[PDB]
Amino acid sequence: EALGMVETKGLTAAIEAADAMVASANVMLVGYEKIGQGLVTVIVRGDVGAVKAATDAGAAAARNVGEVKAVHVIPRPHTDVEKILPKG
Amino acid sequence: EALGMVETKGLTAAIEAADAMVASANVMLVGYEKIGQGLVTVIVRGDVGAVKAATDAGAAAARNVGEVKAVHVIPRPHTDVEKILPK
Amino acid sequence: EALGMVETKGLTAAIEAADAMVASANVMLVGYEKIGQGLVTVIVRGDVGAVKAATDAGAAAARNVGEVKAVHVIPRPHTDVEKILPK
Amino acid sequence: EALGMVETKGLTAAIEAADAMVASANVMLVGYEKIGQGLVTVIVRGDVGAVKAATDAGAAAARNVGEVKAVHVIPRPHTDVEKILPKG
Amino acid sequence: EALGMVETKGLTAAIEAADAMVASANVMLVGYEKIGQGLVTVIVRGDVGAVKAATDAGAAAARNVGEVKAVHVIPRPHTDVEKILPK
Amino acid sequence: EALGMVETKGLTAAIEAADAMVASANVMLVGYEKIGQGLVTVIVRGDVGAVKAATDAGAAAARNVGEVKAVHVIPRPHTDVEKILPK
Numbered sequence: 001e002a003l004g005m006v007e008t009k010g011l012t013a014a015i016e017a018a019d020a021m022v023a024s025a026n027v028m029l030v031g032y033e034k035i036g037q038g039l040v041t042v043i044v045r046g047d048v049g050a051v052k053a054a055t056d057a058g059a060a061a062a063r064n065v066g067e068v069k070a071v072h073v074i075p076r077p078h079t080d081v082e083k084i085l086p087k088g
Numbered sequence: 089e090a091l092g093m094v095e096t097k098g099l100t101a102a103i104e105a106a107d108a109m110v111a112s113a114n115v116m117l118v119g120y121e122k123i124g125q126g127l128v129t130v131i132v133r134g135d136v137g138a139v140k141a142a143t144d145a146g147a148a149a150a151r152n153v154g155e156v157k158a159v160h161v162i163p164r165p166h167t168d169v170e171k172i173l174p175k
Numbered sequence: 176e177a178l179g180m181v182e183t184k185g186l187t188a189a190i191e192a193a194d195a196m197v198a199s200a201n202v203m204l205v206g207y208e209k210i211g212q213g214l215v216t217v218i219v220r221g222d223v224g225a226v227k228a229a230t231d232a233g234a235a236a237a238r239n240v241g242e243v244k245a246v247h248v249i250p251r252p253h254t255d256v257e258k259i260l261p262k
Numbered sequence: 263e264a265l266g267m268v269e270t271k272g273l274t275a276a277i278e279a280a281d282a283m284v285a286s287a288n289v290m291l292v293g294y295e296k297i298g299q300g301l302v303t304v305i306v307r308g309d310v311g312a313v314k315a316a317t318d319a320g321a322a323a324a325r326n327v328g329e330v331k332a333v334h335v336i337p338r339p340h341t342d343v344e345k346i347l348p349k350g
Numbered sequence: 351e352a353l354g355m356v357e358t359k360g361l362t363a364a365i366e367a368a369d370a371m372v373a374s375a376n377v378m379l380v381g382y383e384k385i386g387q388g389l390v391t392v393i394v395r396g397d398v399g400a401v402k403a404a405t406d407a408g409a410a411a412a413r414n415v416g417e418v419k420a421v422h423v424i425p426r427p428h429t430d431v432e433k434i435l436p437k
Numbered sequence: 438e439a440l441g442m443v444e445t446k447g448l449t450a451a452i453e454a455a456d457a458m459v460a461s462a463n464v465m466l467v468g469y470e471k472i473g474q475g476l477v478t479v480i481v482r483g484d485v486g487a488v489k490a491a492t493d494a495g496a497a498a499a500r501n502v503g504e505v506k507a508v509h510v511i512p513r514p515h516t517d518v519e520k521i522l523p524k
Contacts, residue, residue, distance in 0.1 A: 003103070003107075005099075005100045005103065007098055007099060007100040009387075010357055010385070010389060010391075010419060010420055011355075011357060011383050011385045011391040011436075012355045012357040012391055012419070012421075012422050013420065014421035015353070015355060015391075015422075015424070015434070015435070016424065018434060019424050019427055019428055019434060020433075021370065022428040023428055029433065029434070031436070031437070032436040033099055034385050034386065034436075035098075035099045035126060035386075036122065036124055036125075036126070036127060036211075036298070036385075036386035036473065037124070037125060037126045037386045037387045037473070038385050038386050038387035038388070038389045038473075039098065039099070039126050039385070040385055041098075041099045041100055041103075052399060055155050062168075064413055065420055065422055066419070066420055069098055069100075069154075070098045070100035070101065070153055070154050071099050071100075071102075072103075072104055072153045074103065074104060074107050076107070076423060080371070084103060084106050084107050084110060084117070085103065086099070086102075086103075086119075086120045087119070087120075091190070093186075093187045093190060095185055095186060095187045095241075113258055121186050123185070123186050123209050123211075123214075123215055123247050124210075124211035124212045124213050124214070124298065124299070124300075125184075125212045125213035126207070127185060127186070129185075129186040129187060131239070146244065155192065157185055157187075158185050158187035158240060159187075159200045159239050160187045160190075160191060160240050162191065162194050165227075166194055166197045166198045167194075167197050167204060171204070172190065172193060172194060172197075172204075172208070173190070174186070174206075174207040175206075178277070180273075180274045180277060182272055182273060182274040183335035195296070208273050210272070210273045210296050210298075210300050210301070210302055211296065211297075211298035211299045211300050212271075212299045213299070214272060214273065214300045216272075216273040216274055216277075216329050221285070239308055244272060244274070245272055245274035245275065245327055245328055246274075247277075247278060247327055249277070249278065249281050252281055253281055253284040253285055254284060258291065259277070259280060259281060259284075259291070260277070261273075261293070261296075262293070262295040265452070265456075267448075267449045267452065269447055269448060269449040295448055297447075297448045297471050297475060297477060298386075298471065298473055298474075298475070299473070299474060299475045301447065301448070301475050303447075303448045303449055304454075324449060331447055331449075331501050331503075332447045332449035332450065333449075334449050334450075334452075334453055334500055334502045336452065336453060336456050338456070345459075346452060346455050346456050346466070347452065348448070348451075348452075348468075348469045349468070349469075359474075360472070360476060360478075360506055360507050361442075361444060361470050361472050361476070361478040361523070362442045362444045362478060362507035362508075362509045363507065365440070365442060365509075365511065365521065365522070366509060366511065369511050369514055369515055369516075369521060372515045372516050372521075373515045377522070379521075381523075381524075382523040384472050384473070384523070385473075386472075386473035387472075387473045387474045388442055388472050388473050388474035388476045389472075390472055393512060394498075407508060415507060415509050416444075416506070416507050417470070
């Protein structure tokens with residue numbers, strides 16, 4: 001039901017965050033978003049609780065590799081969940 | 089139609105602003121714009137009051153995630169929404 | 176016809192400058208140009224006086240919304256407006 | 263015969279450089295190149311002497327509006343002049 | 351199969367890391383990823399030991415050419431290599 | 438085939454490096470690569486000696502225009518020139 005995000009400065013940290021997120025909780029990786037200036041956002045989906053767990057492990061994983069710029073969990077409607085996400 | 093903008097440093101704060109703005113039934117998400125230096129702009133369209141309330145809710149939500157760089161509402165855009173916005 | 180430019184750091188300020196420019200005078204909005212590092216240029220065309228008045232109005236407006244990096248008017252451009260501007 | 267370049271931080275300064283270059287000497291504007299981080303390169307073509315004159319006025323024009331990052335004149339072969347230029 | 355990454359500040363360092371990685375071990379170059387601010391990531395795949403040896407060799411090499419920002423090996427990735435990586 | 442690279446801060450220095458490298462008949466310009474933070478990489482292909490001489494001439498010329506960030510020659514690239522380079 002919720003959306004989880006880990007924004008890092010560096011792709012290596014983002015890949016590590018992504019891997020940790022999916023390994024730790026029952027979340028599905030939505031994808032990556034590059035906005036420039038080394039900023040990469042990793043987006044995940046699933047239960048709010050599992051998203052909170054995932055985002056936490058992903059934030060930790062990336063801090064061990066590089067710089068974490070933002071960490072957020074967005075509870076979302078079951079009707080139009082991935083609606084709010086960008087189209088690049 | 090009113091134009092509402094919330095500009096943030098980071099995409100995570102932009103997605104958070106967009107979620108807060110889209111929360112009301114009369115506010116429609118136009119899109120995101122990446123301009124560099126980590127800056128992302130969220131643009132919404134709707135009734136003046138709805139847009140004002142939305143952008144305020146956007147900025148409030150965005151602040152807690154990352155840096156809000158700008159918050160603005162153009163109640164009566166002059167050319168047309170499509171013409172006044174970038175491609 | 177003259178060329179008017181308002182360059183801002185942030186898109187929100189640029190949309191506001193654009194709106195003020197077309198509202199102020201009989202100027203035609205050519206478009207926006209993103210060059211990176213949050214820099215957005217709003218370009219307008221018309222009579223020198225209209226262009227001068229418009230750029231002034233767009234700069235003043237954007238200034239209450241964000242950072243204005245440059246404000247410039249080219250009264251008599253060289254290779255006809257289309258040629259002098261980027262694709 | 264030569265290639266002239268004025269690289270500015272800001273598009274407003276680049277448009278001003280471009281306008282000054284074509285107004286001052288017998289040069290032809292090739293175009294603009296955006297490389298990010300506010301960096302814009304204005305490229306001109308013609309006689310080496312006219313290119314030197316153009317680049318000088320363009321550098322001055324842009325310094326009056328914004329930041330000039332680089333100014334260079336490249337004498338080139340008449341066979342393949344614009345060959346060396348980027349394809350974006 | 352394991353995932354190996356060498357992130358550098360500069361493309362020249364990245365090409366050098368890539369070359370050293372494929373020369374050192376039985377690793378397959380997946381590709382390069384540009385994320386802005388001069389950051390380039392070189393990604394390889396193969397046996398954990400081969401990947402460890404390769405990343406080490408690519409980091410050492412790039413270091414004599416430019417700035418290495420990160421060096422990381424994921425021994426057992428989750429959503430099969432293609433899914434875990436960006437498009 | 439040998440691979441030669443000259444990485445600079447600014448495009449003007451990159452065009453200058455490319456002109457100096459392309460000056461010899463056995464050095465072929467592969468292209469330019471923009472990676473962000475004002476960084477531009479010029480890549481050339483040819484005989485080892487020609488590539489070495491070219492990159493050195495590139496760097497020398499580039500220095501006088503802007504900042505040279507990296508200069509490197511890979512005499513014997515391992516995969517293949519097309520495979521070892523970004524898309």
